[PDB]
């Protein structure tokens, strides 16, 4: 039993809710919140920009030190950093950004990072400003993640379409 509330159950382990992931994380304080990161951990917009703003830019400061030490992530890769005031940990995961021409096949690799964590709060990877089809992203999530994932979908119109089209 965990403290996530109001989610629809898609599968044994995948759960979905119309919610602002920032407000969800502040309420639940999960062990792991997933960020829709880029390889540079530049958290300018989308989910990443919103999560960073909620940390008063502390996420960006930590991220800049990480990059200065380790260099950029791989597309499809991840790193674990602090969750600041939002969660114990933030798993920064880089899904392909279609608006940069990045291979959508790397989306499965991106979701595989979730399997290293027993429970996660997460957005749909490569959705929103990353330019992929969120219906496809949900399918890859369900077919790749085996651990317990609680998906927050900010857009109510998108949330309703994802449920009604889910096979
Ligand atoms: O959930 C989506 C990712 N973005 C977010 N998800 C959850 N909390 C959030 N807070 C701020 C941003 C955000 C999935 C792709 C479409 C995207 C869009 F807004 F464009 F419709 C919504
Ligand atoms: Cl977005």
Swiss-Prot record:
Chain segments annotated as coiled-coil in the UniProt record: none
Regulation of this protein's activity per its record: Inhibited in vitro by GRL-0617.
Macro domain location: 1-167
Mode of membrane association: Multi-pass membrane protein
Compartmental location: Host endoplasmic reticulum membrane
Catalytic reactions on record: Thiol-dependent hydrolysis of ester, thioester, amide, peptide and isopeptide bonds formed by the C-terminal Gly of ubiquitin (a 76-residue protein attached to proteins as an intracellular targeting signal)
Purpose: Responsible for the cleavages located at the N-terminus of the replicase polyprotein. Participates together with nsp4 in the assembly of virally-induced cytoplasmic double-membrane vesicles necessary for viral replication. Antagonizes innate immune induction of type I interferon by blocking the phosphorylation, dimerization and subsequent nuclear translocation of host IRF3. Also prevents host NF-kappa-B signaling. In addition, PL-PRO possesses a deubiquitinating/deISGylating activity and processes both 'Lys-48'- and 'Lys-63'-linked polyubiquitin chains from cellular substrates.
Subunit structure: May form homohexamers. Interacts with N protein.
Record protein name field: Papain-like protease nsp3
Species per Swiss-Prot/TrEMBL record: Severe acute respiratory syndrome coronavirus 2
Lineage start: Viruses, Riboviria, Orthornavirae, Pisuviricota, Pisoniviricetes
Boundaries of the shown chain within the full protein: 1025 to 1191 of 7096
């Amino acid at each position: 039993v965990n403290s996530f509330s109001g989610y629809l159950k898609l599968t044994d382990n995948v759960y979905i809710k119309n919610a602002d992931i920032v407000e969800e994380a502040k309420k639940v304080k999960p062990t792991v919140v997933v960020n829709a990161a880029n390889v540079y951990l530049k958290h300018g917009g989308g989910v990443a920009g919103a999560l960073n703003k909620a940390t008063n830019n502390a996420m960006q400061v930590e991220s800049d030190d990480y990059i200065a030490t380790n260099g950029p992530l791989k597309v499809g890769g991840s790193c674990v950093l602090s969750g600041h005031n939002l969660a114990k940990h933030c798993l920064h995961v880089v899904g392909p950004n279609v608006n940069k021409g990045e291979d959508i096949q790397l989306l499965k690799s991106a979701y595989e990072n979730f399997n290293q964590h027993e429970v996660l709060l997460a957005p749909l990877l490569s959705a929103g400003i990353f330019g992929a089809d969120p219906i496809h992203s949900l399918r890859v999530c369900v077919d790749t993640v085996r651990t317990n994932v609680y998906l927050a979908v900010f857009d109510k119109n998108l949330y309703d379409k994802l449920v009604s089209s889910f096979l």
